[PDB]
């Protein structure tokens, strides 16, 4: 281009090299320059597999798109697939390259443009300005195709970190990861269903087990301890993702109950509806309010109460997910702003209860706690993020018509349930309100209560506050009235929010009741921590406990 002489040489290249095959020498006789000829030839070699038809080759040679592995690529894309700015090939900050002009002279390693000097299978790539990610591939258009090499993400990490190749090696608590190849680390990976596509390099954070929470690593302490690492995952609100019951856990460690979860002895098992199942459609009475009321006996047999031993005192709700594991909120156990830090032997639980106030010797059962597991991502300094805990009973509990576990949903189930046209349900003894407010007037209920609440669209729930709602929370409740406090502070603190599957007829815990502005302020919705990402954390906790035995 530009010079006349050059424009002639361009036409000759077209005639002899593009419309026809040419030799290096033929090419040189046309360009009359070793450099120019080497430059051309490297492209011509990169386009070996795309020599016909002519336009296919012309496109490949222009270099604005990747053909095959994209050694042909010569375009000006600056950024990684995840949006990280590419490091200059000539720089050594933050990474010091191993591939340069000298090692790969025909690769056109200029500025910080994505290239594929090493014929890497992920296509053109660059060293990144993120000191925790050495190299990453870029999203390049494919030649002759409405398509790109790898999907773009908007400055965030996809697939819950399963593509992550970086070198972050501390957990969110600043705990150093251990090496995956370390003896104790190998002993715990022994027979896990680790995806071999995830490379377990050094002690870098990885997600080899498909954990919905994201990347993690083992850390020093008790054998099997681990923690999650801070990556900026893409906002994936499960609300908006487009039969039978299959068990996830191992009964030897989870305990009994999963197979039969979510089917109540006194209702589903007798083919009887409870009094408010009939009002569970969002369309019920045009969607208008229906106030809470006394529960029927045994209509929420996974309900659990957490008590201080001395002074005897009701602390929190909780939920039964097997015969030995119980799910609640971490703030129930550890909340430094109230100087709260309860140990196992401070507490007990009561299961199968109906009356708050009475010892119900025919139905209720008392269990002690063996261990408490606070979620490793729990953070109270922020906004009660991952306000979740798991408790292990000292002895398993006996199931009965009043004591039965609830199901836990995975991601598919959760998206499915938030999107069928049914409300959710909160039951308890008003412990949230009692704990978090002065609760004047209306006393605490003496009998288990129930109310049903419709799920609220995430953008509407977002506009109901100036608080940032992470994708791990959701709102539920009826159209508020800014004149009235409404019923946005229902249930027990740490207690269950549940929904019934219209597909397999079982009850699933979708949420854990957390504190929300509803407790203090008009015009709000109730606020619930998602549980759908927890399964692989739980699975790892129940192995950590397997080790606890010696
Ligand atoms: C690209 O890498 C080469 C290979 O390591 C670098 O060349 C070496 O540089 C050291 C000095 O730092 C010399 O002592 C060696 O003799 C060189 N080895 C060879 C085989 O040349 C080179 O300097 C790097 N180039 C850039 C642009 O960073
Ligand atoms: C909550 O309190 C318990 C009990 O006081 C603390 O347990 C201590 O743990 C540290 C570190 O492992 C030990 O030095 C102490 O010996 C433990 N105390 C007892 C009585 O066993 C625990 O550290 C507290 N948790 C938090 C997050 O502050
Ligand atoms: C690429 O990088 C340049 C220089 O760093 C930047 O200013 C520009 O916006 C980017 N160009 C493109 C085409 O994305
Ligand atoms: Mg032509
Ligand atoms: Mg010729
Ligand atoms: Mg010809
Ligand atoms: Mg000649
Ligand atoms: Mg000739
Ligand atoms: Mg000539």
CATH number of 251-538: 2.40.10.10
Q: Is the preceding omega at residue 249 within 30 degrees of 0, hence cis?
A: no
Contact between residue 406 and residue 508 where contact means Cβ atoms under 8 Å apart: yes
Of 130, 385, 387, 487, which residue is the catalytic one? Answer: 387
Q: Give me ligand 9 centre to Cα 107, in Å.
A: 26
Contacts of 123 (CB under 8 A, 6+ apart): 66, 69, 70, 73, 116, 137, 138, 140, 149, 150
User: How far from 499 is each of 356, 400, 416, CA to CA, in Å?
Assistant: 23, 22, 11
Mutate to test the pocket of ligand 3, among 77, 78, 114 (most ligand atoms within 8 A of CB): 78
Of 41, 77, 58, the residue nearest 149 (C-alpha): 77
Q: Using only C-alpha atoms, what is the Rg of the chain?
A: 30
Look at ligand 2, atom 26, and give the residue with the nearest C-alpha. Answer: 341
| Strand ranges (E), 187-269 | 216-218, 226-228
Our answer to whether residue 401 is catalytic in this structure is no
Give yes or no for residue 64 CB within 6 A of ligand 3: no
Containing 56, the helix (H) or strand (E) segment is helix 54-62
Structure tokens at 229: 């690492």
Containing 543, the helix (H) or strand (E) segment is helix 535-548
Experimental method used, please?
Answer: X-ray
Q: Give me ligand 6 centre to Cα 20, in Å.
A: 5
Reported structure resolution in angstroms: 2.2
Q: What share of the chain is helix, strand, coil (3-state, %, to 5)?
A: 20, 20, 60
- What angle do the packed helices 54-62 and 34-46 form, to 10 degrees? 120
Instruction: Provide the 3-class DSSP secondary structure of residue 463.
Output: helix
Give yes or no for residue 78 CB within 6 A of ligand 3: yes
Q: Give me ligand 5 centre to Cα 9, in Å.
A: 11
Of 146, 149, 145, 140, the residue nearest 64 (C-alpha): 140
Give yes or no for residue 345 CB within 6 A of ligand 2: no
Paired with 66 in beta bridges are: 142
Contact between residue 501 and residue 452 where contact means Cβ atoms under 8 Å apart: no
Look at ligand 3, atom 2, and give the residue with the nearest C-alpha. Answer: 78
Task: State the Cα–Cα distance between residues 3 and 11, nearest whole angstrom.
Answer: 13
Task: State the Cα–Cα distance between residues 154 and 171, nearest whole angstrom.
Answer: 24
- What angle do the packed helices 4-13 and 24-31 form, to 10 degrees? 160
Paired with 393 in beta bridges are: 369
Structure tokens at 41: 């030839």
Our answer to whether residue 493 is catalytic in this structure is yes
Contacts of 220 (CB under 8 A, 6+ apart): 175, 176, 178
Task: State the Cα–Cα distance between residues 508 and 525, nearest whole angstrom.
Answer: 21
Closest ligand 1 atom to Cα of 98: 2
Mutate to test the pocket of ligand 2, among 339, 341, 346, 374 (most ligand atoms within 8 A of CB): 341
Of 139, 322, 493, 514, which residue is the catalytic one? Answer: 493
Structure tokens at 532: 């759908």
Task: State the Cα–Cα distance between residues 451 and 465, nearest whole angstrom.
Answer: 23
Of 39, 40, 57, the residue nearest 48 (C-alpha): 57
Whose tokens are 């349900």? That residue is: 425
Give yes or no for residue 76 CB within 6 A of ligand 3: yes
Look at ligand 1, atom 23, and give the residue with the nearest C-alpha. Answer: 102
What angle is formed at CA 353 by the lines to CA 451 and CA 342, rounded to 5 degrees? Answer: 95
Task: State the Cα–Cα distance between residues 86 and 129, nearest whole angstrom.
Answer: 6
Paired with 407 in beta bridges are: 508
Chain mean position to CA 404:
28
Give yes or no for residue 103 CB within 6 A of ligand 1: yes
Domain residue limits, the chain = 4-62, 76-155, 169-234, 251-538
Task: State the Cα–Cα distance between residues 412 and 419, nearest whole angstrom.
Answer: 11
CATH class of 76-155: mainly beta
Containing 152, the helix (H) or strand (E) segment is none
- What angle do the packed helices 34-46 and 24-31 form, to 10 degrees? 140
169-234 is a CATH 2.40.20.10 domain: yes
Give yes or no for residue 110 CB within 6 A of ligand 1: no
Instruction: Provide the 3-class DSSP secondary structure of residue 116.
Output: coil
Q: Confirm whether 76-155 and 169-234 share one CATH topology.
A: yes
User: How far from 43 is each of 350, 386, 499, CA to CA, in Å?
Assistant: 74, 52, 60
Give yes or no for residue 221 CB within 6 A of ligand 2: no
Task: State the Cα–Cα distance between residues 161 and 165, nearest whole angstrom.
Answer: 9
Instruction: Provide the 3-class DSSP secondary structure of residue 412.
Output: helix
Question: Sheet harboring 325-328: ordered strands across?
Answer: 365-367, 347-351, 303-308, 313-320, 325-328, 389-393, 369-374
């Amino acid at each position: 281009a530009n010079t006349f002489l050059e424009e002639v040489r361009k036409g000759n290249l077209e005639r002899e090299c593009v419309e026809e095959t040419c030799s290096y020498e033929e090419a040189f006789e046309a360009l009359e320059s070793s450099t120019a000829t080497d430059v051309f030839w490297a492209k011509y070699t990169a386009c070996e597999t795309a020599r016909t038809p002519r336009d296919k080759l012309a496109a490949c040679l222009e270099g604005n798109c990747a053909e095959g592995l994209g050694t042909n690529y010569r375009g000006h894309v600056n950024i990684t697939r995840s949006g990280i700015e590419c490091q200059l090939w000539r720089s050594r900050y933050p990474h010091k390259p191993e591939i340069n002009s000298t090692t790969h002279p025909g690769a056109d390693l200029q500025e910080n443009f994505c290239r594929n000097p090493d014929s890497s299978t992920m296509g053109p790539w660059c060293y990144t300005t993120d000191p925790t990610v050495r190299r990453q591939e870029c999203s390049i258009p494919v030649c002759g195709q409405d398509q790109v090499t790898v999907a773009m993400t908007e400055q965030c990490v996809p697939d819950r970190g399963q593509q992550y190749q970086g070198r972050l090696a501390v957990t969110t608590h600043g705990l150093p990861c251990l090496a995956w190849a370390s003896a104790q680390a190998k002993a715990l990976s022994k027979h896990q269903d680790f995806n071999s596509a995830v490379q377990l390099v050094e002690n870098f954070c990885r997600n080899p087990d498909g954990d919905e929470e994201g990347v993690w690593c083992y850390v020093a302490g008790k054998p099997g301890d681990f923690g999650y690492c801070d990556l900026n995952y893409c906002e994936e609100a499960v609300e908006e993702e487009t039969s039978e019951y299959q068990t996830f856990f191992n009964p030897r460690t989870f305990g009994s109950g999963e197979a039969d979860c979510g089917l109540r002895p006194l209702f589903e098992k007798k083919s009887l509806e409870d009094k408010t199942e009939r009002e569970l459609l969002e369309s019920y009475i045009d969607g208008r309010i229906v106030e809470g009321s006394d529960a029927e006996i045994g209509m929420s047999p996974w309900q659990v109460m957490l008590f201080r031993k001395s002074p005897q005192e009701l602390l929190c709700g909780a939920s039964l997910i097997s015969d030995r594991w119980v799910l609640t909120a971490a703030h129930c156990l550890l909340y430094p702003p109230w100087d709260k830090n309860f140990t196992e032997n401070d507490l007990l639980v009561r299961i199968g209860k109906h009356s708050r106030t009475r010892y119900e010797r025919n139905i209720e059962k008392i269990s002690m706690l063996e261990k408490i597991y606070i979620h490793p991502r729990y953070n109270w300094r922020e906004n009660l993020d991952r306000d979740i805990a798991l408790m292990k009973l000292k002895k398993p509990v006996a199931f009965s018509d009043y004591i039965h576990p609830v199901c836990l949903p995975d991601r598919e189930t959760a998206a499915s349930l938030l999107q069928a046209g049914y409300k959710g349900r909160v039951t308890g003894w008003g412990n949230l309100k009692e704990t978090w407010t002065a609760n004047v007037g209306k006393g605490q209920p003496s009998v288990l209560q129930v109310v049903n609440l419709p799920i609220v669209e995430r953008p509407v729930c977002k506009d109901s506050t100036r608080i940032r709602i992470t994708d791990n929370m959701f709102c539920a409740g009826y159209k508020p009235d800014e004149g009235k406090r409404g019923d946005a502070c229902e249930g027990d603190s740490g207690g269950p929010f549940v929904m019934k599957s219209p597909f397999n007829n079982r009850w699933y815990q979708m949420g854990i009741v957390s504190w929300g502005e509803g407790c203090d302020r008009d015009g709000k919705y109730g606020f619930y921590t998602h549980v759908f990402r927890l399964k692989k954390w739980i699975q790892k906790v129940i192995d950590q406990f397997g080790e606890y035995l010696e």
